[PDB]
Amino acid sequence: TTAPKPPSAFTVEAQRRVEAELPFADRADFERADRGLIRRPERLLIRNPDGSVAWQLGGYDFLLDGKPRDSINPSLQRQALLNLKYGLFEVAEGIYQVRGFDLANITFIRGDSGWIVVDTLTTPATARAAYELVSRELGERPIRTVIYSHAHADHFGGVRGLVEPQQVASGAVQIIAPAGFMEAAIKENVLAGNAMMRRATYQYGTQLPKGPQGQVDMAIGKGLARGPLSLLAPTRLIEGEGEDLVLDGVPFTFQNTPGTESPAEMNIWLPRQKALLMAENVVGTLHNLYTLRGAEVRDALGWSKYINQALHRFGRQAEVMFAVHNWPRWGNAEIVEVLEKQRDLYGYLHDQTLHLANQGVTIGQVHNRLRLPPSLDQEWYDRGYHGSVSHNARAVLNRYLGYYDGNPATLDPLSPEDSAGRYVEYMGGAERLLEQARASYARGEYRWVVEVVNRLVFAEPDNRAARELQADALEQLGYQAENAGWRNSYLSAAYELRHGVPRDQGSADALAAMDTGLLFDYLGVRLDAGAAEGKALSINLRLPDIGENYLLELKNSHLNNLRGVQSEDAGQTVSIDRADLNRLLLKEVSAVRLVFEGKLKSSGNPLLLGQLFGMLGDFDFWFDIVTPAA
Amino acid sequence: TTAPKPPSAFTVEAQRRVEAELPFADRADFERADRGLIRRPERLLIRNPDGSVAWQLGGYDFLLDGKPRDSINPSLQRQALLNLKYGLFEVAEGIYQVRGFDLANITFIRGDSGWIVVDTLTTPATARAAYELVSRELGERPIRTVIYSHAHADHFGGVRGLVEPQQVASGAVQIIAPAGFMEAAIKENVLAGNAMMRRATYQYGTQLPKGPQGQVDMAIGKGLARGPLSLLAPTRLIEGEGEDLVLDGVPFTFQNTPGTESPAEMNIWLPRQKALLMAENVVGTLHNLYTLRGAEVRDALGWSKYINQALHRFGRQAEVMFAVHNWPRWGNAEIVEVLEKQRDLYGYLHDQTLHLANQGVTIGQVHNRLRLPPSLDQEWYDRGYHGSVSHNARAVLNRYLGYYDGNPATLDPLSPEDSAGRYVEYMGGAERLLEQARASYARGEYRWVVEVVNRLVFAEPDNRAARELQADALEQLGYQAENAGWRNSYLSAAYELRHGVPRDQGSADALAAMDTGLLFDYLGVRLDAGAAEGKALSINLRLPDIGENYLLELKNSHLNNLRGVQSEDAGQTVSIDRADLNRLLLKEVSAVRLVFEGKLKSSGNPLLLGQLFGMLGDFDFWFDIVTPAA
Numbered sequence A, B: 001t002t003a004p005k006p007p008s009a010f011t012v013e014a015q016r017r018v019e020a021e022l023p024f025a026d027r028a029d030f031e032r033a034d035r036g037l038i039r040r041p042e043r044l045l046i047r048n049p050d051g052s053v054a055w056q057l058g059g060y061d062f063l064l065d066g067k068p069r070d071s072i073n074p075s076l077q078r079q080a081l082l083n084l085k086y087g088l089f090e091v092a093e094g095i096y097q098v099r100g101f102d103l104a105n106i107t108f109i110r111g112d113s114g115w116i117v118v119d120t121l122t123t124p125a126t127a128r129a130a131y132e133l134v135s136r137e138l139g140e141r142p143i144r145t146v147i148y149s150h151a152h153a154d155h156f157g158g159v160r161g162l163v164e165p166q167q168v169a170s171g172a173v174q175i176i177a178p179a180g181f182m183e184a185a186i187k188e189n190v191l192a193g194n195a196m197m198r199r200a201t202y203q204y205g206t207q208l209p210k211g212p213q214g215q216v217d218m219a220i221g222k223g224l225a226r227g228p229l230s231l232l233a234p235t236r237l238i239e240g241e242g243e244d245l246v247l248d249g250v251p252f253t254f255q256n257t258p259g260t261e262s263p264a265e266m267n268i269w270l271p272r273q274k275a276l277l278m279a280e281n282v283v284g285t286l287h288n289l290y291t292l293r294g295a296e297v298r299d300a301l302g303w304s305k306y307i308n309q310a311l312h313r314f315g316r317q318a319e320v321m322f323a324v325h326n327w328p329r330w331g332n333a334e335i336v337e338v339l340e341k342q343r344d345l346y347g348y349l350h351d352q353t354l355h356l357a358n359q360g361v362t363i364g365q366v367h368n369r370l371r372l373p374p375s376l377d378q379e380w381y382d383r384g385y386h387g388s389v390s391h392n393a394r395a396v397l398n399r400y401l402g403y404y405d406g407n408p409a410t411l412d413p414l415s416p417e418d419s420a421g422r423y424v425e426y427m428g429g430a431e432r433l434l435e436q437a438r439a440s441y442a443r444g445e446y447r448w449v450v451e452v453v454n455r456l457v458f459a460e461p462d463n464r465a466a467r468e469l470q471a472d473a474l475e476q477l478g479y480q481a482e483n484a485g486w487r488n489s490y491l492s493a494a495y496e497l498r499h500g501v502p503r504d505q506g507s508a509d510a511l512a513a514m515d516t517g518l519l520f521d522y523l524g525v526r527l528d529a530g531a532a533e534g535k536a537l538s539i540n541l542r543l544p545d546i547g548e549n550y551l552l553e554l555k556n557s558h559l560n561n562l563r564g565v566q567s568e569d570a571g572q573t574v575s576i577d578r579a580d581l582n583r584l585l586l587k588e589v590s591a592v593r594l595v596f597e598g599k600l601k602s603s604g605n606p607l608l609l610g611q612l613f614g615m616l617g618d619f620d621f622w623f624d625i626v627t628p629a630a
């Protein structure tokens, strides 16, 4: 069958073990998450301008009664219910948050004459809804300052729902960010963007229903609001180690924590309230050193040290600690302990992964050997809801030693679709492998079943019996998973094995924010090597609006670009505003039109830029993951 | 049997294919490598002070006749013979190199009154031997300037064979390096050091004999000299983009290429000779983006761009191009082409890996899909002797997307020693798996055999039949490998499967150069978590010779350290020179003695530092790789 199955006896038993192993009697988070509530609006529904729906929570009504569901890990169920504590809250005097309107929180700090707003959610409609809630409960006041705590779309993406460019231009609104915001806001999402976004469908569970056999939570929030991605550039950057400022009479200390959860990030200390806003360094979960959708491995050592610096600078004096995800902590001794343990969590993960690695434990083993000590294991905010000890330990190991385990048996591996037929043959053929795998399934050996049956799937991708057993086993693993990403991934893979992948199926602000060099780097990634083979051309590119020149050199099937160089020998020189180049690439405009408008001038051979663009391919979104290519 | 086998018919056929596919008629490198030879001394043998042998080449006499050996890839054999072109050479007027005295080259540039020396080989004895050769052939002159081209031990390691500290102290010798040398010289070799050095035994083939069924070459040189590792700190750093200097009347342009082959590296342009020294950005082979022994993935995009910057700055004017490995290129048009193609090699590798990845091709497949275009494939300096297209394409993919393929079948994998029994069972048991694997072996399917028989090895590590077949198959892959690291690794793995791993079995200058923060980071990696569990202590550490204070905080089984902080609440305060702390850790001294000498003062609880040190474990070098733990 093609539908979700009940949790097996083995999965049920695994959930009871979770209950035996974790501190469910510690219910203090339920108090914390309701503390200071001003309004929880009754039927949240946020729509976008084009009529699409950005966010709603009605889907999670099944969680409200608190009754345990064996298709959900009970530790994950606990988090899922706590993340449903949404609405407008007071953190401290003149400090509020709107939580559960998006993946992240949005913070409103009362100024003498207006608000200082920290972060802006993922899309303008959710930010605007949050602001409207604030206005209704607390009174309407202008926003004079918007601060980006760090460079991720769930923090800067809704900025246009709060402010417009003319308010920035007139100086009515400042935008404050850590130095390195603009580079960090775009870079890592670009060159490998289609791969990352497709893989993220699994981690976010975008094709799953909301429900007990579907998506239930996203660890740091319910999920990501859907809508246009906005971004307005900072007018003031916090440099070096940080800075002390006064904003509309309120004193702010910014502590830059470069290269932890984001390349550009800062904590915020508010001495008048003794309130510490920990960016996304410290949330209600272990975070990602490595995000499954795919990016570079983060530095656990620097992350751990930056938390210790916060602890040393502010920990002694903090009365409340709050975050850009999840809920606050009140009281100095609690806050000190949370900081200490989070510092030591990332620290232990790092140091002990390398301790094992130095003993010869490989990237293929470390997750099955590394275990937190009780002092770190037994806090709810250290649980692997977003990150996991398992995939993080692997990541630290991969950061230091790479993907290769050291064993030359694995140095030149056959692609799995090329080794699959032989695995299957050696195992007695498809029916015999299925027979053996079903017996393994009936002993609950799901981690093994998904390994071996995946071989049959890759040998015989249209074998329905193998797809359905693989899916069943993956599902049970998803039911079992404490980690929301893991859960979403397993259930998504079962979904695609049962149903197949979608047959039926870019932000202008993001493009504007991309450095020109990176834009040409991406066009080089698009280059179709067959079309480029044996060609050679070069183009001088002049961009007067931004005062930058590039030299583009196509040769040996590689597109090169260099900032601030021109060649007397280039075959063509193209003058074009970056803003117009952007419009061209977003297909808001044609090349011919820009000529006619006096916006795209050319000397030399006028065909070369057209010829280069004609060499660029595109990528299909819905690539195969759990089977080989159709 | 336990001894190397003949190349099989299939391996022989693979070598003939190599000959059919690669441009062996292009023999110009043989001219290049002999050009300007002044002396090749007849029986090179370099000894260390303790009586050990640092370097000799008699082992490779089998290569001298040029006759093809089917146990060696003929493209690798070609490189192996070219790397045997050792001795003292002229590059251009007043510019010489000693090649083949170590893995790297050492360069002597004639000053008005002395030598400027670029790099220093791996150990003092090989440098000193090189210098003595120079003195005999060209006359004895003092060295006034030593330059480190980049931060690797094969470049700075022999410096004490050329100069002593008092010559530095008096200002008779300057030492010039790129900014970031001292950090780069140590950092990446530390935290994961034992794992990297053990794994390197394979890549370097340290247990193999020199000979046709053993080690034959190390791509960028013959091999690494063995001896003490020296390092003296730079007295002058080249900052920013680079610098123009005159040294003993000779004009030098330094072009910093930070973050390519090393974090701190620079090319050198000598306008008087029109001579371009390309550091290790450009060598006689494709280089590592990822070195098998294990380190972080290098940035192919920046590497490619830095070569293009060199090409644009100097390429137009260069008459000779030479390197810190391998041999020079003469003539402007040849030099331009080599730069272009190397730029596009790293560029193509990068862009096309991501092109495929954006199509859904995973880290498990990309090496079997990515192929260089003919213009890059068909040059000898683009061959994968040191790096490979295969392991590099995987590395670029791992840099951008990580180790995880996106398929949740592989998200929570059983350790191989835990899945092995089940693979073996499913395949009919050990004899049946062996029976099938031998038939596969007899069709030449060695890449498959080493995958499947490795499963039997990990299930049954004392199964001699499985070890010996695994070894045989690995060996044939080593015979076949164009890459010297791959070859050494396969042959080393066969060696350990047949013979078992060694039962019978630190630089003071390196330790001195390590940043104190990193030293305490490493001690944290050593922390035995069982011994630390439930303990908490803190220590103020004061280091007067270096004017630095640290705060050490042990808690939650994690050792923390913070530069420039002290705590009034620390349980102990220890004052100690860094130099004395180093001696302590190198066991050149005892803690008690330093007290008695007035060099280690303490207040507060005097036991805490001792207690912390007693929690630190150590690592065994000779860990198991090709089998599970004995």
Ligand SMILES: [Zn+2]
Pocket (backbone or CB within 6 Å): A150, A152, A261, A262, A280
């Ligand atoms: Zn973030």
Ligand SMILES: [Zn+2]
Pocket (backbone or CB within 6 Å): A104, A152, A154, A155, A280, A324, A325
């Ligand atoms: Zn966030």
Ligand SMILES: [Zn+2]
Pocket (backbone or CB within 6 Å): B150, B152, B261, B262, B280
């Ligand atoms: Zn190097």
Ligand SMILES: [Zn+2]
Pocket (backbone or CB within 6 Å): B104, B152, B154, B155, B280, B324, B325
């Ligand atoms: Zn080198």
